[PDB]
Every structure is written in structure tokens, then in C-alpha cells.
Design a protein around this ligand. Structure first.
Ligand SMILES: NC(=O)c1ccc[n+]([C@@H]2O[C@H](COP(=O)([O-])OP(=O)(O)OC[C@H]3O[C@@H](n4cnc5c(N)ncnc54)[C@H](O)[C@@H]3O)[C@@H](O)[C@H]2O)c1
Ligand SMILES: NC(=O)c1ccc[n+]([C@@H]2O[C@H](COP(=O)([O-])OP(=O)(O)OC[C@H]3O[C@@H](n4cnc5c(N)ncnc54)[C@H](O)[C@@H]3O)[C@@H](O)[C@H]2O)c1
Ligand SMILES: [Fe+2]
Ligand SMILES: [Fe+2]
Lengths: 382, 382
């Protein structure tokens, strides 16, 4: 239906895929890698691990661990500098979403024009970014496989969006071994983010038969494995399932886009720098009820995929039960009860709702609302 | 077991996807294209169509329409000659699986030099093929998105399989506008080929959560639209659904690989010069029954995705009902009833089985047999 499916040419997954991925670099002609990650990744030795595997392949590396949650333009320039001083010939992002976005920005500018803003928009760059490999460590973002790059400009205090086929990593890596170390909180929040991606992509007005297939399979796997990974981060089968699941969710949202959960969430965790993952998790149930008036039938499909015994229910009751199941799941893994517990203030709703309707994710939401409707939706999230 | 998921980074689909894909070449830098197609595509004017759209973007093009079913080394060589004399900077395949494979080979050799036979096997090429855009016109092969390139050596009558991430097209195009012209025979054939891909991918020992989801969705869409597309090729929705379906089947088989149906069918064609699509179509049900002893349960899963009322049946029964549904679907769209009609001769069975066991697709079949069993499988299809 006049659509486009974006995704990396190569996506390595499963236990041991990291070594496989690095091993595949031998003979590639790369000599100097730029490892873009965060403080924690470098501290716990994950960076070292990569650097050594790389050395065993005759490839040296330089490290930039100055990435903070919700990347910034200063982080990028910071990486470009380190990149230049080491004359890096390729980039490797390591960690959760933040490192990938920063890395995508580094690699794009590395081979293209100047500042980041010059690429704020859709397919702005004319040249492919420097080869980029993204190694994911959380089970919920999928930023390692998206063509999205959101860099925050602390000047104008506005977050720029770079939707470009050129920021799609050349190779994505989802090795569950690097995920076993996720504490319960990050596991629950990123997993609920993955679930949100499935729900919003499946509900999107830009949905295709492909995104639908991936979205439902993702919700199914998350429904059968998120609780386990939260109650036992060492359960390798559950970790591998979530890695696959979060990728499937990405296959879906990277191409069908999202909705009001994210449009609204980006405002709480944007102006109030809250952890992306949880904001979506708490908002999800409430947005589903709102959208249920238009896509009750499809919310039921998701509930059915989730293993719920509702196939015989009408779409209305099926959607409610699915909405209830999401609430029960969130509660079972420690997700906050409402925005009140997130530190949000009801007096900020009018501002949040206005900026929410402005978010690019709001465009594909199945139900379109006005200022009043988004404000009341917010207030109900408290 | 860890896995890898291969796919072009950009995949354009739906009505109008052709115009979008060509428009996106603007500012790409490509000024001279080698269009690889066949006699039909050229005479019917599809080649001119594409050539003209390229012109509107200031891109010249040279055509090679010598491709025939089961692309050969000779065809590859001729195409490289035209490429050379025109110094084409990128390749565009146009048509079904034959042009895509021929184009992948031409593109791979253009940058890697040597001969086609040198790349037979896994990831043998050292450099990425010349940029390649694949425009698919049949609804069943998906070769516009795979990392497989099958070329036939006419001199010694030998099919060579090139399994290399470097042959993955840069951009795939699936515009149902180019599939509307498929005659009922080709619609039925390629449609059954896509269904075979789904079955074999779902039955494969290299299946993953991702290939499973894609395979099942492909089977569900085919069971719902193939018959409609055959009865009336002017039905755009049907054509578009078949296009997404065949792509989804490719998402599955390019990654989990195939099985005995293709292992055997590749021989019938590479010997009696029979159409790829029809060979698998007639063999499918006989191989499914053969494999039913090991994967009856998964075979039942496909049946359910196909909408069969077998959810409440046991695996053996569910599987048998699935296989019968396949036989009935094939009959309903005019697939020849057996290998005798195709012109296959029992006297050649011993050699067909021998080579079938040596086919790369055979390694993933869920049930491994021997010379005698494969010969008997063949004869059972006469
Ligand atoms: N394109 C979009 O619209 C979109 C969608 C979803 C998320 N995002 C972006 O993605 C980012 C969210 O990334 P995220 O939640 O994966 O994490 P971050 O938010 O990437 O990292 C969070 C923290 O978890 C740590 N961590 C990562 N893996 C770990 C492990 N295995 N064990 C222990 N600690 C680990 C990090 O070191 C860090 O301290 C945000 O910047 C968000 O805005 C963008
Ligand atoms: N992943 C892979 O690499 C892969 C998978 C399966 C099959 N294959 C290969 O692909 C080939 C099979 O290709 P196929 O069945 O698509 O067909 P071809 O075999 O591409 O073409 C068959 C005939 O159909 C015609 N045709 C194609 N599109 C048409 C249209 N829109 N309208 C009217 N006629 C049209 C052709 O001009 C030709 O006469 C085999 O050679 C096989 O080995 C490759
Ligand atoms: Fe998200
Ligand atoms: Fe096939």
C-alpha cells in the first residue's frame, strides 16, 4: 500500500552472536573502530570485552563513553573529535538506545556535512554514514535497527529527529549474553517499551501486513517471557525470547511508526527527562482505552496473540480484557501505578498535551484528538 | 542456536512503489543503469516504462533482455559484456526470479571479477556487488530480497548456489501494478512457490521466532488471496496481498532456508527445463506427507494460519487435513496433477534423487532420507 520496509542488511541474534559479528569483521579492511557507549558499559568491562574480540581480529579501537541517557549534540561533537584523532574507519555503538542514536549521528556526520541539525528531517543526507555496527544491551528499544536518530540540542532545548535510511546500522547485534545483567527495573521498563511498540505499531494508521505480523509475534513473546526475565534475569531462554521480541517490535514500529503513548511519553520523559521505558509503560493502558473506541477489534487481536482466552469475546470486551491484562502485567513487574508516582503535575497537562499533539508519533495514532481530549487523557493517567 | 536475519535495507512495496523507488535515485549519483530483464518484459514494454522513469531522473540505461528461465552462466557473461561496453554504475533487475538471480551474478562479478563458479558456496566474495535494485513482477519468488543467487552452468548442466550477503539487493521493489499482467498460469505457479517457501521455512531445522512469524503470515495471506488473484488478475487488492505474502515468505526462507521440495524441484527444472514455480507446486503435497512424520505438529500450525478448521484436531489429523487443503488449492487453480504431465520420466529418477540429496536446500529438511527414499518420493509424484 505504497509503503517502505527499512531494516539493517544483517542482524545477528542469539547467544554468541556478538563474537560471530566481530569475527565477520576479519578481512573486512577495518583497522580503527570507534566504540560509542556510556559510562556504565565501559565501567562494567563490556567495552573491554568488545575491544579484545576486535583486537583478536586485527582491529584496534578508540572509546567514547560520554553518552548520557537521551543523547545530546555535545555528545555527538565529542565523539566526532575522538573519531578524528584516531582516524576511525567505522563505528560500533554499545548499550541501550542512547548510545545508538549518538553513534548514528556520529557516523552520519563523519561522512557527510557539518552539524547535526543539517539532517533534522527525512532522508536529508546525500551520502551513506560511516559503516556502523550496533550492539544492543537492553530488551526493548530496537534503536540498533531503526532508521531513526533523535539528537537533543541543549541550546534551543528541542529534540531533533533524523529519519534517514542512512542511519540504519549496517549490522545489528542482539546477543542475550549482554542482557543477562539487566536489573529487574530496566528489564521491566524496556520490556514494556517493547510491548508498547507492538501495540502502537499494530494500531498505527500506517500498519502493513508485515508490521502486523511482527507486532503480534512480539506481543506474544513478551506476554510469555517478560515476567520470567524480571523474576530471573539469569533465565537465558527468557532473555533470548525478549531479545527476539524487542527486535520484532522494532521491525514493526520502525516501519508503521507509533502513536499517542509515545507522543505523550516523549513529553514527560522529554521536558522532565524521565526514563523513556517507564513513561510508556504507565501511559499504555490509558491510551489503549482511548484508542479502543476506534480499534477495539485490533486490540483484541493483540490480546489473543498474548495468549489471552478471549477469542470468543466481542471486540469491545476483548479489547477491555486485553487492556486489563496489560495492567496486570505491568503491576506484576513493578511498573508505577500512574503519572502521579512519576512526579508529574496535573497543572502541566495543558503544556504536555499541546506538545504531545505536535510530536511526529501523534500522526499515526488511530484516534485523532484535540487539545481538550489529550489533556483529559493525561489527567486520567494520574 | 544463534541466527542471522538477512534482508535489503530498503524495501518498497505497494501501488506506486516503483515510481517512489526511481524518484529516490535523484541525488544518488547513479547516471548509467544496466537493466537486466527478459524477452517478455522488454517486448510488453515494461522495460521501456522503467527506462523512461529513469530518464525523467537524468539516468541513462542499457538493456540486457537475454535472461531466460533458470538463468545461465552464458546469460551472466552476456550481461557483463553490455555492462562493460556501457560502463554501467548500477544494476536493476526487472521481472521474476530469473532476472534477479542473473542480475545478482552480474553485479557480484562486476566488482569482484573472476567467474560465477568461483562464488558457489557461502560468502566467497570479498567485496560488495555493484549497487543493485530489484524490481519484482511475479508473486512467489522473493529473490528480489534474498542473499541467494542460483545460476545454471549449461555447459555441464549444473546448478550453482551462491549464498552471499553481498548479493542482497540494495533496494527491492514490489509494485503490484507490474504483477497485474501475470497470466493465470504464472499467478498460480509463483503463488504456489511462495506457499512452498512458507511451508519449507516453517518446517526447517533453522527456523527462528522471526522466520516462523513471517512464514505463517505468508501462508495465511496466500490461502486468502491466491485463488482470487488467479480467477481475476485485475483485482489489485488480491495482487497487492500476494505481493506482501511472497515477500513475507522470502523473509522466512531467505533466513531459515528451505527443504526437500526445492531440493527435488531444483532438479526437475535444471533437467527438464521446467518452470521453478510449477515443479514445487506439484511436489509440495508429496513432500509434506513425507515430512509429516517428523513435523506433523508444525504442519498443523500452517493449516490453522491458512484458516483450516483443524485447530481441534490432533497433529497427525491436522497435518493430513492441511496437506489435503494444499492438494485442493492446487487443483482449484489448475496445477498439473503430477510429474507425468510435467514431462518427468521415471527413468531419470535415480539421477534426480542423487543430485537432490546434494542440493543446499536438503540440509534443512526436517526429515533426512537416503537415495532410495528420495527416489521413492519422486516416483510417488508421477
Ligand atoms: N526512535 C524513537 O522514537 C525511540 C524509541 C524508543 C526509545 N528511544 C530512545 O532510546 C533511549 C532509551 O534506551 P534504553 O532504555 O535501552 O537505555 P539507555 O536509556 O540506553 O540506558 C539506560 C541505562 O541502562 C544501562 N544498561 C544497558 N544495558 C544494561 C545491562 N545489560 N545491564 C545493566 N545496565 C544496562 C546503561 O548503561 C544505562 O545506565 C532513549 O534515548 C530514548 O529516547 C527512541
Ligand atoms: N532466493 C532465490 O534466490 C530464489 C528463490 C526461488 C526461486 N529462484 C529462481 O527464480 C527463478 C523462477 O522465477 P519466476 O518463477 O519468478 O519466473 P522467471 O522464471 O522469472 O520467469 C518465468 C516467465 O514468466 C514471465 N513473467 C515474469 N513476470 C511476469 C508478469 N508480470 N507478467 C507476465 N509474465 C511475467 C517471464 O517473462 C517468463 O516468461 C528460477 O530460475 C529459480 O531458480 C531464486
Ligand atoms: Fe519506545
Ligand atoms: Fe521456490
Amino acid at each position: 500500500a505504497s509503503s517502505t520496509f527499512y531494516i539493517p542488511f544483517v542482524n545477528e541474534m542469539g547467544e554468541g552472536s556478538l563474537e560471530k559479528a566481530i569475527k565477520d569483521l576479519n578481512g573486512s579492511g577495518f583497522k580503527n573502530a570507534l566504540i560509542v557507549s556510556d559510562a556504565f558499559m565501559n565501567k562494567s568491562g563490556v567495552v573491554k570485552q568488545v575491544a579484545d574480540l576486535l583486537k583478536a581480529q586485527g582491529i584496534n579501537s578508540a572509546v567514547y563513553d560520554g553518552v548520557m541517557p537521551n543523547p545530546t549534540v555535545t555528545a555527538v561533537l565529542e565523539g566526532l573529535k575522538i573519531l578524528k584523532d584516531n582516524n576511525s574507519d567505522f563505528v560500533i555503538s554499545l548499550g541501550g538506545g542512547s548510545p545508538h542514536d549518538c553513534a548514528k549521528a556520529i557516523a552520519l556526520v563523519a561522512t557527510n556535512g557539518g552539524e547535526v541539525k543539517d539532517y533534522e528531517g527525512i532522508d536529508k543526507s546525500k551520502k551513506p554514514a560511516l559503516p556502523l555496527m550496533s550492539i544492543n544491551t537492553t530488551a526493548g528499544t530496537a534503536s540498533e535497527m531503526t532508521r531513526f536518530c533523535i539528537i537533543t540540542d541543549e541550546v534551543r532545548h528541542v529534540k531533533m529527529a533524523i529519519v534517514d535510511r542512512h542511519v540504519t546500522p549496517m549490522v545489528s547485534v542482539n546477543d542475550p549474553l549482554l542482557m543477562v545483567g539487566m536489573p529487574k527495573g530496566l528489564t521491566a521498563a524496556t520490556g514494556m517499551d517493547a510491548l508498547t511498540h507492538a501495540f502502537e505499531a499494530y494500531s498505527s494508521t500506517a500498519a502493513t501486513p508485515i508490521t502486523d505480523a511482527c507486532a503480534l509475534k512480539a506481543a506474544s513473546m513478551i506476554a510469555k517471557n517478560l515476567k520470567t526475565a524480571c523474576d530471573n534475569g539469569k533465565d537465558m531462554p527468557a532473555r533470548e525470547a525478549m531479545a527476539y521480541a524487542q527486535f520484532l517490535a522494532g521491525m514493526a514500529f520502525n516501519n508503521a511508526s507509533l502513536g499517542y503513548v509515545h507522543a505523550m511519553a516523549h513529553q514527560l520523559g522529554g521536558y522532565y527527562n524521565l526514563p523513556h521505558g517507564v513513561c510508556n509503560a504507565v501511559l499504555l493502558p490509558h491510551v489503549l482505552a482511548y484508542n479502543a473506541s476506534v480499534v477495539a477489534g485490533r486490540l483484541k487481536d493483540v490480546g489473543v496473540a498474548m495468549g489471552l482466552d478471549i477469542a470468543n469475546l466481542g471486540d469491545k470486551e476483548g479489547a477491555e480484557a486485553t487492556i486489563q491484562a496489560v495492567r496486570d502485567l505491568a503491576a506484576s513487574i513493578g511498573i508505577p501505578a500512574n503519572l502521579t508516582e512519576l512526579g508529574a503535575k496535573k497543572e502541566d497537562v495543558p503544556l504536555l498535551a499541546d506538545h504531545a499533539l505536535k510530536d511526529a508519533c501523534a500522526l499515526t495514532n488511530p484516534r485523532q484528538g484535540d487539545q481538550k481530549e489529550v489533556e483529559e487523557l493525561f489527567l486520567s493517567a494520574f
